[PDB]
Amino acid sequence: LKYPRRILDVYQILQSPIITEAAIKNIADENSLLFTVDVRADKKMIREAISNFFGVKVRKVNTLIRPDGTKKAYIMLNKEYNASELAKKIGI
Amino acid sequence: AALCLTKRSRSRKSLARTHGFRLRMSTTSGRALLKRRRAKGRKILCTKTNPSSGKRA
Amino acid sequence: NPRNNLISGQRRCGKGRNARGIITARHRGGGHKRLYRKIDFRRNEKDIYGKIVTIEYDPNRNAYICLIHYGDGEKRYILHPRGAIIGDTIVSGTEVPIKMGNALPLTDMPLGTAIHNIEITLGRGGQLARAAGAVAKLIAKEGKSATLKLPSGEVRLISKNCSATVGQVGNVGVNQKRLGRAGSKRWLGKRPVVRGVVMNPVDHPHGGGEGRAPIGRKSPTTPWGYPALGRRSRKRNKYSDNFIIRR
RNA sequence: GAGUUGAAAAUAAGCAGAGAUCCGGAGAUUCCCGAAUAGGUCAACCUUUCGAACUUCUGCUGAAUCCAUGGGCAGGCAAGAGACAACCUGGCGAACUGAAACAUCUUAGUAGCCAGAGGAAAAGAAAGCAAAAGCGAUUCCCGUAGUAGCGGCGAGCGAA
RNA sequence: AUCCCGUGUGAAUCAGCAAGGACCACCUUGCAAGGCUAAAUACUCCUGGGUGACCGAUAGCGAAGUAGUACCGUGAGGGA
RNA sequence: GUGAAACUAAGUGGAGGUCCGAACCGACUGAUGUUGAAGAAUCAGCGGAUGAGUUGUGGUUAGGGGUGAAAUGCCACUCG
RNA sequence: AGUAACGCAAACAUUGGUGAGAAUCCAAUGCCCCGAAAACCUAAGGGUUCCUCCGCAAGGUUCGUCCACGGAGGGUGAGUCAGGGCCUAAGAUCAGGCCGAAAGGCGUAGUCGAUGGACAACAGGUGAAUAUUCCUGUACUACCCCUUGUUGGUCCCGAGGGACGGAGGAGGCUAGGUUAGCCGAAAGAUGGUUAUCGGUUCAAGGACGCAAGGUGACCCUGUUUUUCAGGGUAAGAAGGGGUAGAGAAAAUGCCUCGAGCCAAUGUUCGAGUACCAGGCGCUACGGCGCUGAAGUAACCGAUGCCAUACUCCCAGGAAAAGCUCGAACGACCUUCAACAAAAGGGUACCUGUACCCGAAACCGACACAGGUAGGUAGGUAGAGAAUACCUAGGGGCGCGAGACAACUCUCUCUAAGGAACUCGGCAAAAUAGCCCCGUAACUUCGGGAGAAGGGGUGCCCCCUCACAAAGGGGGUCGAAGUGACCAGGCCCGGGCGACUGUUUACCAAAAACACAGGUCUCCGCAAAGUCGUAAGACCAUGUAUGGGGGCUGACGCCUGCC
């Protein structure tokens, strides 16, 4: 059997995007975009929940904790997909 | 030389191995201390650290 | 050849002194790591020869030890006696002739011989007369005992079927190796001892007052109250194997 | 039976005279730590062969040893662990104090510490009191009574 | 004396054994060395009613707001 | 230099609980400072500075005690 | 009482700007300070103090437009860095097991436990707050797929290895520094002058390979054995390889082949259509835009590498996993399954990441003249990490301004004398560096000793030159030549303690303690002694040349009587 490290309610593993101006800097400059996830999350569970719900090959998943408690995730997509054409569809 | 100052910059890992919750729950005496802490009503019955993260504030 | 894979590694840490942590064997601490040497006291390979290739300094002992090989593939350490020619051959066994360096049970040998490593009963490793010059002689034997004069001026009839390594054990010249550097006592892991006159009455019974205090008590005592001169500390009925104390 | 989405206003959308909000009975969920229990842990974390670990019960196989025992494997809504202010029981158990000192004694088998357990616990159904007359398990209250006593016959202790 | 234990010795069954304040004789009373039982009974972290020659913000719970909180101590703990 | 010893120039070597002196450790004298800048320090010199050294981190001994190169010293500015 | 104080005596001053208001906030120019830091980074700790905007109720020992303060928003990006997914030390917890009123004590397997062992990333740019983390270049780890072979493979077991001390100095080099060459600019209102001012940079990694460095065994010949010239050995290196015994690996014994080996450094690729002085065009005047020269050599020389390399010494210097090799026994799975590689692609686990960290943010209740492990160590003069002044970088110490009373404190000098002061030369003054001469009493013959005491010292010439230091002779100035800082005062006696050390944190550093040495006494191992009711533990994985305990304190003469 292929167990994950922790079973963590995968339709709630992502919470909200970040709409700061530096996030748009990461879109136009990095082909990346910014999500807010819960602390109980992975570079294997978030990375699977982007290539399925969105339909995009994700390059890397750079995560960090934020001292108010919640977790911040810079997800960088592949070169084949612009983050600007996939972020205006959501509302960025 | 130094001063007659007692507490210093010791790591909170070693302060949690002595005054933390595990050595406080590894004895009948220390869990009786937690009977007095929970019986009084202290919001922080130990002074500890965390092996993963620092503080959620 | 150091790192023999016979130095055996893990020990209890240095010259320790802690039972529950309380000082209970006083004046200990300091020095090097002093990694011990697991030597072969009870020779479990009889009637096979073995040469002598190295006289290594054991820091745990007062004497030296030596590395002995075999005709088969093994390596041991034993206490080498006085007269260990390099390359000389030692062999344990029951009928092996007497040579300075080999071992044999206490029966098949004459009387009046220099032996260091003897056993007080069967099966043990090695107990008596194994210091840096400790030599035990044999007075004549008996039915199942053997009167043995061990190096205290003390004789003792003993079980006759005990292993014994015949020879006078070497490194005698530590009788005269002076410790005149005066802090070389601390290199052995031996802290300085304080004296009973210059302590307080809470610590020692001879805690004095003004000046160099005379000893005050009717007898010079230990720091735990027992008289420290002449009072024999020995249980009155243990063995009755010793013939005369002779001391 | 008429308005509601806590304190707690405002804003955005709802939910409601085929009965909302709310109240009551029985259920469901209850992340993580904590008996904490898959293993570790520096509690609210990490690693995971995603596991009620251990003790007890049941079942199979059954070491040194023939029967056994130990072990291993398995099942089990699976009995115990942990918590609890005071009272209660069992065990260890003082000292300051009073005696105008103090050691016998008192304070005191009190406080404290540990263990256990219930709404009460302990005790309890006469190998008992009593005195020539009689009662009929245990517990508690009033009384005898501050009596009989006990005690450096001191301080005090004190029934039946 | 009665009652219970430590070491060691160590009985009798009803024609007996134990108690009745050393002990013996007679009488009286009861049947140890096996267990279980509700009630009256003691208390409040509490709960639901009713009261108060109880308090009224230095009082009454330490605490009428963040109350065992801020703060102090490494900690036990102290504490507005 | 004698048949070998005993002993000595000369190099080579780098031993020391060696010397001078920084970091570092410690506190001998003096002044200042005494509601101090500081509940023990500043300034000027001072002792050790390859050791019986100094220090970080993780530990250990706990109060009818521990530990003490021994002062009743120290054990959280508290220790007969 | 509107009194002391406003927290070192590094020091600020002016012109502008912002505003209602400016010694204090900002900008510029000078001035001044640290510079083995008062600089930069990280361990701990703190926990949001970091950044933009807004505010000046409280805090800032003054003010304030500013802030480590108040409010809103944001910020900490890792396969490679540090820990965990690996391993163990001290130590802790200890299944069973022994013990014990309870609680629990002892103790084995086992498991945790870094301060250690194992394991893969560097350079440039971006940027209000992040950089080995984001972008680009080149890499490297750990598995899968794609091609060749194998029928066994994995784990447990057997072994090698991991694997370790201190001191010492000499080599070979790098890092840095200086000089020269090259390139660009420069007239800096002064007598002359370009002699001036700035660059001269590049890592990890992939390949090739090492000498005049160390190591390679013995003897003779030449030289100071030595660097080298020359001959012989059949083992005499790094290393492999056969066997023999119960002997797979290993270990031991025997035989044989190998003259080389080891590692920093190095050339090339990475690496230039990078970086860089300069000029070229606008200023929100805070910077962006285009183009771009040379990018070498030598002398010093590391405290960094070789390097756990050699030599010496006793006081004799952790453990386990990763890694490598391998038979039997034991558990499981088996053919397109497992194993070993060769290129090429794919995939990349959690936590920490801000900021302060020789401190205003940590610890001292303070924005406190104090403390805090570790790393980098520029120039000149100097032996130097002291010292004096400075580059980089960072500050001007969060009250100032007048005045120039007594008196305190921190310093400087003082006619004549020189301890007359005083409890006492306490404190100050004086000596001070390198070379040469010379150096006594005494002694344990080691020392005293740098004894004491005396002379030279700066700068220009020449020659001898180990042809680098250095010497002699000469001249030149100053009153004074280690001209500043820095940098021994010494001798003669005596008492005590032999000595180096340790001691009352915060009034005593000593003659006190310790010490090497001596002596008495106990102890035969199921030892004595110590802690614990006990089990047991230290003693000790040691064995009378050893382990306790008492007293005395090196060394020399002795230690009397009862």
Q: What is the CATH number of the domain that holds B42?
A: 1.10.287.3980
Angle at C64 between CA C60 and CA C70, to 5 degrees: 110
Closest-approach residue (CA) in chain A for B57: A68
Give every CB contact of residue C222 below 8 A, 6+ residues apart in sequence: C205, C228
Site from A38, A65, A66, A72 to mutate, B interface, most B CB atoms within 10 angstroms = A65
**Residues A71 and A37 sit within 8 Å (Cβ to Cβ):** yes
Give every CB contact of residue C224 below 8 A, 6+ residues apart in sequence: none
3-state secondary structure of A63: strand
* Strand F reaches within 7 A of the C28 CB: no
Q: Determine the Cα–Cα distance for residues C161 and C144; give it in Å rounded to an integer.
A: 8
Q: Determine the Cα–Cα distance for residues A64 and A46; give it in Å rounded to an integer.
A: 13
Question: Which residue, chain included where needed, has tokens 């030596």?
Answer: C66
Q: Which fold has domain A13-92?
A: Alpha-Beta Plaits (3.30.70)
Pairing of strands C145-150, C137-141: antiparallel
Tallying the residues shown for chain B, one arrives at 57
In degrees rounded to 5, what are phi and psi of residue C118?
-115, 165
- A83 by Cβ neighbours in 10 Å (0-12 / 13-18 / 19+) ranks as buried
Nearest of C112, C100, C128 to residue C41 by alpha carbon: C128
The torsion angle over the Cα atoms of residues A22, A23, A26 and A29, rounded to 10 degrees, is: -70
3-state secondary structure of C166: strand
Q: How far is CA C88 from the centre of its chain?
A: 24
Chains C and A are in contact, defined as 3 or more C-beta pairs closer than 8 angstroms: no
- What ranges in A1-92 are assigned the alpha helix state H? 21-30, 45-48, 83-87
Distance A22 CA to G24 C1' (A): 37
Q: For chain A, how far is it from start to end, CA to CA, in angstroms?
A: 39
Other CB atoms within 10 Å distance of the CB of residue C78: 24
- Domain holding B26, by residue range, is 1-57
Q: Say if the Cβ atoms of B57 and A68 lie within 8 Å.
A: yes
The amino acid sitting at A26 is N
**b/e map A5-38, b = 16+ CB within 10 Å:** eeeeeeeebbeeebeeeebbebbeeebbbbbebe
Q: Determine the Cα–Cα distance for residues C146 and C120; give it in Å rounded to an integer.
A: 11
* Strand F reaches within 7 A of the C203 CB: yes
Q: How far is CA B40 from the centre of its chain?
A: 17
Other CB atoms within 10 Å distance of the CB of residue C129: 22
Q: Determine the Cα–Cα distance for residues C170 and C55; give it in Å rounded to an integer.
A: 11
Q: Determine the Cα–Cα distance for residues B50 and C153; give it in Å rounded to an integer.
A: 66
Domain range annotation of chain C: 1-91, 92-247
Domain range annotation of chain A: 13-92
Sequence positions preceding breaks in chain C, C–N over 2.5 Å:
none
Other CB atoms within 10 Å distance of the CB of residue C37: 17
Other CB atoms within 10 Å distance of the CB of residue C131: 16
Sign of CA dihedral C44, C46, C48, C54: positive
CA dist list (Å): C51 to C48, C86, C88, C99, C226: 10, 8, 5, 13, 51
Q: Determine the Cα–Cα distance for residues C218 and C230; give it in Å rounded to an integer.
A: 13
Work out how many domains chain B is built from and give that number.
1
Q: Which two tokens stand for residue A58?
A: 């994700």
* Strand order across the A14-17 sheet: A14-17, A32-37, A71-77, A58-65
Instruction: Please name the method used to determine this structure.
Output: cryo-EM
Nearest of C107, C115, C103, C168 to residue C142 by alpha carbon: C107
Return the bridge partners of C227, or none. C221
Q: Determine the Cα–Cα distance for residues C231 and C110; give it in Å rounded to an integer.
A: 38
Return the bridge partners of A61, or none. A75
DSSP track, C188-246: TT-PPPP-STTS-TTTSTT---SSS----SSS-B-TTS-B-SS-----SSS---BS---
Q: Which two tokens stand for residue A5?
A: 């490290």
Q: Say if the Cβ atoms of B57 and A65 lie within 8 Å.
A: no
- B57 by Cβ neighbours in 10 Å (0-12 / 13-18 / 19+) ranks as exposed
- What ranges in chain C are assigned the alpha helix state H? 184-187
Q: Determine the Cα–Cα distance for residues C119 and C100; give it in Å rounded to an integer.
A: 18
Q: Which two tokens stand for residue C133?
A: 């010059």
Q: Which two tokens stand for residue C196?
A: 């009973």
User: Secondary structure of A4-17 in the HEC alphabet?
Assistant: CCCCCCHHHCEEEE
Measured CA to C1', the nucleotide nearest B35 is D83
Q: Which two tokens stand for residue C44?
A: 């479990």
Sign of CA dihedral C145, C149, C151, C154: positive
Q: Which helix (H) or strand (E) holds B35?
A: helix B28-40
Q: Say if the Cβ atoms of A68 and B54 lie within 8 Å.
A: no
The CATH class of C1-91 is: mainly beta
**Resolution (in Å) of the shown entry?**
3.3
Q: For chain B, how far is it from start to end, CA to CA, in angstroms?
A: 38
Indicate the DSSP class of residue A76.
Answer: E
